[PDB]
Design an enzyme around this catalytic site. Sequence first.
Site, short mmCIF file in Angstrom:
data_model
loop_
_atom_site.label_atom_id
_atom_site.label_comp_id
_atom_site.label_asym_id
_atom_site.label_seq_id
_atom_site.Cartn_x
_atom_site.Cartn_y
_atom_site.Cartn_z
N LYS A 177 40.12 -3.58 28.86
CA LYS A 177 40.06 -2.13 28.91
C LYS A 177 40.07 -1.56 27.50
CE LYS A 177 42.54 -0.28 32.52
NZ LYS A 177 43.95 0.24 32.70
N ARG A 181 40.82 -3.56 43.70
CA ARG A 181 41.52 -3.40 42.45
C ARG A 181 42.95 -3.04 42.81
NH1 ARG A 181 42.37 1.59 39.47
NH2 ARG A 181 43.01 1.18 37.29
N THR A 192 36.83 5.69 36.30
CA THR A 192 37.72 6.84 36.34
C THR A 192 36.99 8.15 36.47
OG1 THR A 192 39.28 5.58 35.03
CG2 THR A 192 39.70 7.94 35.25
N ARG A 212 56.98 6.62 25.86
CA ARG A 212 57.47 7.76 26.61
C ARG A 212 58.53 8.51 25.82
NH1 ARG A 212 56.09 5.48 31.86
NH2 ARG A 212 54.10 6.58 32.26
#
Lengths: 407, 518, 505, 421
Positions: B258, B63, B316, B110
């Site tokens: 995802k 990955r 994860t 952000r």
Amino acid sequence: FFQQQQLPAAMADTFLEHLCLLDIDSEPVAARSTSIIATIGPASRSVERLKEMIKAGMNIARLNFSSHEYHAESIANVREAVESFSYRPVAIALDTKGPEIRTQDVRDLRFHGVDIVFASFVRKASDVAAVRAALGPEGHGIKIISKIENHEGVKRFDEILEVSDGIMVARGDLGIEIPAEKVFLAQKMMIGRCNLAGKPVVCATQMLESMITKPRPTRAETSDVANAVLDGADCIMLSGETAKGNFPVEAVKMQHAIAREAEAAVYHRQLFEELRRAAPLSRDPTEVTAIGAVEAAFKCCAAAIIVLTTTGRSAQLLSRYRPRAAVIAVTRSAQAARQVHLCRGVFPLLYREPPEAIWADDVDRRVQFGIESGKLRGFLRVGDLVIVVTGWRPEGYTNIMRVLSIS
Amino acid sequence: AFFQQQQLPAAMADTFLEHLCLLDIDSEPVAARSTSIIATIGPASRSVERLKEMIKAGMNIARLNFSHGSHEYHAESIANVREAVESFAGSPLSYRPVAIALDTKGPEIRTGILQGESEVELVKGSQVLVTVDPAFRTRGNANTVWVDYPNIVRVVPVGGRIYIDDGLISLVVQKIGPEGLVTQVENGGVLGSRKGVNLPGAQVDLPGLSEQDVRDLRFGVEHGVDIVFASFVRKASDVAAVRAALGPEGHGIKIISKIENHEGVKRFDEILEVSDGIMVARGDLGIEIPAEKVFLAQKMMIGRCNLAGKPVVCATQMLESMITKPRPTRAETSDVANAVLDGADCIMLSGETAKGNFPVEAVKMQHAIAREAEAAVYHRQLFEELRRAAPLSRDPTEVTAIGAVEAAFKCCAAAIIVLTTTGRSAQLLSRYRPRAAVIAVTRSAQAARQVHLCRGVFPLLYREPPEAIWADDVDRRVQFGIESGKLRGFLRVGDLVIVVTGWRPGEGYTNIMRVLSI
Amino acid sequence: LGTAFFQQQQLPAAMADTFLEHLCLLDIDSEPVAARSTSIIATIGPASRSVERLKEMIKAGMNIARLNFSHGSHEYHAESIANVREAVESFAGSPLSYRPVAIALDTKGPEIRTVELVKGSQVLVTNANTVWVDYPNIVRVVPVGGRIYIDDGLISLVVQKIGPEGLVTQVENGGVLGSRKGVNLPGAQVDLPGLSEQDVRDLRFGVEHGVDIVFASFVRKASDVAAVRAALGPEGHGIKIISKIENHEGVKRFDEILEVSDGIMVARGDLGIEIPAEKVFLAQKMMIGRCNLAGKPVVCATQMLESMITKPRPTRAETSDVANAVLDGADCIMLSGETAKGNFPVEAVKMQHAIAREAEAAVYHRQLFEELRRAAPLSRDPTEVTAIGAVEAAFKCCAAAIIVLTTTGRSAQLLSRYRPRAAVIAVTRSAQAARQVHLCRGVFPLLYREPPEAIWADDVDRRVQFGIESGKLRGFLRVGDLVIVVTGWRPGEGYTNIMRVLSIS
Amino acid sequence: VAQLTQELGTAFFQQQQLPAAMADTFLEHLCLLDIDSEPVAARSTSIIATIGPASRSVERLKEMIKAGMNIARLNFSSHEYHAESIANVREAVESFAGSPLSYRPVAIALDTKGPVRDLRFGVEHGVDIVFASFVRKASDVAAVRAALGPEGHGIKIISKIENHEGVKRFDEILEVSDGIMVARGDLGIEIPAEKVFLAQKMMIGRCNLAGKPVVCATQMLESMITKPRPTRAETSDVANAVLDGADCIMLSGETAKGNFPVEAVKMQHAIAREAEAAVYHRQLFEELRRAAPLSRDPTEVTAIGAVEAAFKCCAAAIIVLTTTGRSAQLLSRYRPRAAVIAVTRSAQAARQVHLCRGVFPLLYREPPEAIWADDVDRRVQFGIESGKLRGFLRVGDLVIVVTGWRPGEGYTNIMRVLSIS
């Protein structure tokens, strides 16, 4: 299309919903698969009526032994009606007389190429070792169906079925040899253990009695025939109604009609799953291939499973997992073609054309033989899907299933 | 002695409860590990000799995480992966294909720069203003926060939350207006500059792709990656943007969406339909929904991917503490095992292999665990439930596949050997979760890589010359499968295998099933 | 019935026809409204010793305070105990919201103990190449082929010669050996006594200070729990023994240990040293399944939220582990260093409460209740028959609570073992029982301090009423709710034989 | 487990097909059926005998009662004759009212002639059950109900499903009727005779779901019209209608005009008993649990609670205090193995709960006590004595006792576990 064959009820999530979705307006379209055994007598010795019965549904003719020239006429008469012809094998079963004192046989047994023996009053495994010893190595290929008819036999059922090829639920004698109200228990128990074991089982006597002297059966007798099919019986029987009675063919007609209706209302979802859980693992490649072919049959609503076999064995292991799809068995053996009428769902086809030089080619020829017979007889149409079960070299080696569209 | 192993006494139990009770730690998992392992490549796993070690430990997919690193960087990682993989090419019976995946950075929100590498403390209770006016873009207060997403004021209502800095700071909208969003600080904390922002429950109208992701995905197509893990997939239209970024040469690339936020979880069904598969991305999912809820989203998504027959990845923090320690915590081994029990086709390692000190041991621990857990799967109930939930089919590949898996269970087959050119037959086998290994012989190096996404499938790449008589070319490939499997341990003489093949060439099918003694 | 009915506590997933479908209908927007039923054990230490801190932990959900006797003095533990009881009793001024909190004593246990770097071969066991162990029967119980782990399972050696002079081993995994490090003997029948001399003193201290529960370390066989029971002696007859299963022989003799224990702790810490780390989940799921089938409580222990020792939020594997412990069947979940020593004790309790609450609602009761009943033997115990009928009544009407009167806690436990979704509100006058029933999932204990009334029907009635008002006050119960009420026709237990369906007025 | 064999002995668990009852599958349940396992539970499928020439004697009707008749059926296809019949019944029933602990209520049903004035005859002759003939849609029964009128509000409408239309509009028929009869005689004429089991198993199913009585009828033991012993097909038919789910079974010319009318009843009784013991409750209870909707009706809740408890301890009986019979019916729908013993003051409910499989109605004559709880305890203790006298109950047995917190049948909501002394 999906409305037929009780398919709405076949897809219910529980046994209870299934019952609630049985539809009297849903039509049996599959071939009738439970074999009818007809008991031969006066009303059925005419080579005329044997033609009329074999068209009515008869699969096995039963020779009750209660003279030799009498039964030898019966034989040759059945056989002539069979060879007048869609050709439909018809097996011949000898139902021995057995001991008698109100609660020889070696001559009857040594006595013409019978396909089946309904051995009588069986109670132990030795009993079956007898009949098999008496039949001698020349009588091996014959099928022993132990009749169970007394308390001792009920209780020793596991040792009997162990050595037998099959079982009969001899309800006539059981209903005197044990309280009549307990017969249904004996029946259901025995049918269930035979389905568990994959060995054919027979329900018998008084199933359509009233039809001995009426054209229409009672309500109880309609229900009784259905419920034996529902219990899992491979073959249902007719005794007087065809030996000594006024409606031999109306009988065989209505056993055909009833069983056609009951077979469709079997809840395969639960039966298959409960065989997946109760049956032990197998390491026989023929059984393995069979459970595969049945599962595939269901996944695509197969019209038939076409199996090649010489001894009938491959078609039997298909029959034990109860495909809705018809088991079109193609065989060069002619006794096989008669003896598989003991396994629910197997329609035999006898291939007489000789071998061919390449193994692959002989197989296809037999397989197309099955497709064309099937096409002509109403099992197969084009664009149907079928499962095909064959071997790689010539019975033990039956280990291939293919999915095929009918062209 | 056969019954001692692979938890077979627990497999025969009549209920799930009793299946748990008959689990036995002395029942060795003889069968081979079928759940594929994804290792994120980085400083700690880039080198060729390490990669060889990791391959041997059991890595199956590499990955590349484009949240960080230059294209020159990942090119060299791809390079070194392929060198490690092809070092074993000299032994065809043992060659282990390895897929390569690109994980996109994804769109992001952000904060601005403060008056300063400085810091300032946002106080619970305190009133904070979130503005998209460029004035404050460098003038970030303790009571004013600037954001690079203009539509944040269009998409968080009064009563909505704004999460800053990996979820540590929380803000609630009290009033909406022309100078911006009036907030109150709910979770106080210290913010720096250009921190990560998360809008829980919002429908973010950001593009399915950022400008960096089109550059990264073009790079991907040019380098022949088998797999894209697409970040922040909220809707079907997001996955179609990804496919167009892959262009004409990328039609054969698997797109694994995802699911990382509330909107993607609620639009799951529409996403799975146009996706090849799903990653349960617990990291961002755990910032976007209450942490105590992620296990619900995991098991729901895995359940639906199993129903649909599509690969699903759990990702994860699975063995997170192994970034610095040679052995994981008890929660970590349990997490890997339950991911497998849940139904995941793949389990993942991120930092554990990209930057920690025991990357090889982290692959090894997932292998050992996944192998124990596969054996403890209650197939009696799973097979029944997948059988009944799946529809009838007149596709001969599907039909043969269910037949083959039914037959395998009846004899406790050691393997099912399948000939596939696309992978599709192997996948239709995998969707019924046989216990028997699905040994998939293929001539397509792409397919061999790509079916690692499918649990139970061991790909074998067949290079040998075609044979004139097709029936002979089939036999040689089945032989290749048998002999590859003998030497890798999947098959012993005596074992039964189911073999699944086509009736004639380019009939597009598998419709042959055979039962074979070794 | 309604719609908002089915849009919470995962009820669409509760009623799926299969497990697979149940999974698929799990919904993150379906809030759990039921009260959290899985009890939380918090290990006490410097992070959680002050009275003010312990109040915060009680309010965050701590139900059992665990006392780890591997370290600290009797006087130190007597102080933990006093501060817990002070914090617990600070809330007793409100009878309708007072939460009991049990105190458990986790024994140090038997111990085998010992900077050279044992490398890749040849050490003898009786510094650098020899190791001496304070366990003379090592030479007797580790065969040729057995293994010796040292220091937290870091170093392993393999037996190759049992000689007169000891055991000659090969180093399988090398590293840095210090002084007096713990030793483990994987697979061995370790013939150490059930109890250490320090434990006997610790158990006596435990009875003297009134602890409710003993977590007994390193239990391998029935004889070991008898020794623990022996050391508690007759004044500790009412203390629950929870046997810590920590090694291969414990797991292999689980049945004979369960039968004489009051319950089980799956001690994952030492188990993953004593058996391959990759196999613990197998021992956890088997032990929880068997405890559930027996109706005895089972604790899941160690590293559930380990990273919260230093971080304010757990890792994704950690929340997963806590949810799956609940989904497995565990009655209790446990915190060790996360509450003893770390920096976020209260938050670690809060996280366990929050995960447990979500996971409780995600249990597939349709299958769980079908399997617990098809697997449990028939019973002639009127209290068991009544419990299963009441749990069936509670599901039929999605009752809000089952209210039970219990003196020893037994009636409540027999309701707990059929895993109702409805809360089991257990009304008792025994303060210890009310502490102890926290071992049983789904049991919210209510301590009733009013003196009995002279007439029995009236005493039963006031205690049922205390349970409804407490339940109203705490949010369990609204007007119009249905509850199931479980009582006896007379004083005793075995006489809990009445089930009533009640409308909360 | 050892308390179970200490308390009941080992032989208890070889009886009533208990070894087959615990099987993990229906197949294996069948394989474990055993002809030596004896059906100790009381026979609970009620018997309907059609009255005729062979069954009108006041002293024959006594033989039929002691043999197990529970509902007397009056086929209307002449008044002077039928009121004469009603009178013989009631004389016969009351000959045993001298000993209440053993008195057996018996009901009286009027089976219509087919295609208004026969009803009001029934109505003010106090009959309990109408067997409406040829019903085909909901209005045909609404029509029936109206004819009965106010004097017939308490009367139970059992719709006979005789033709294709009624089979196909069955839901709405069932939706309004109190119960259903699967009229096989006519239905085998009006549809193919080979499809009748389909209609049968289908209707029983849906009635079992609805918690509403269903009756199997006509030609069950026909051969006993002129023969002392039944056909193998006919014993199977009876057994199979119980296994199907039928609440009630009926005799037509076996008792009306045949030579063995007390052997036909006797035989229905012995078959039904064996067949009840053979039911696969594990699957049946689960399927009825899974299909029956969540209820907030305290009587429903209490009934499933008590059924569950009866299975847990293989209770000898469930004792229920009911006035309309609703509580006994809601118990009957979940098909307990344990006898449902229904203690009622209403003589008409005591006759009518014979429609509900498993219910054994006992009629309580004594006057209220002052205290509601005293009155309950004296009604319960009557059910117990009645049961011990009749051999349903022995000292040591456990029973489930179902009662009410205050008077009224919307108030059945207490469940008690009790040891018989």
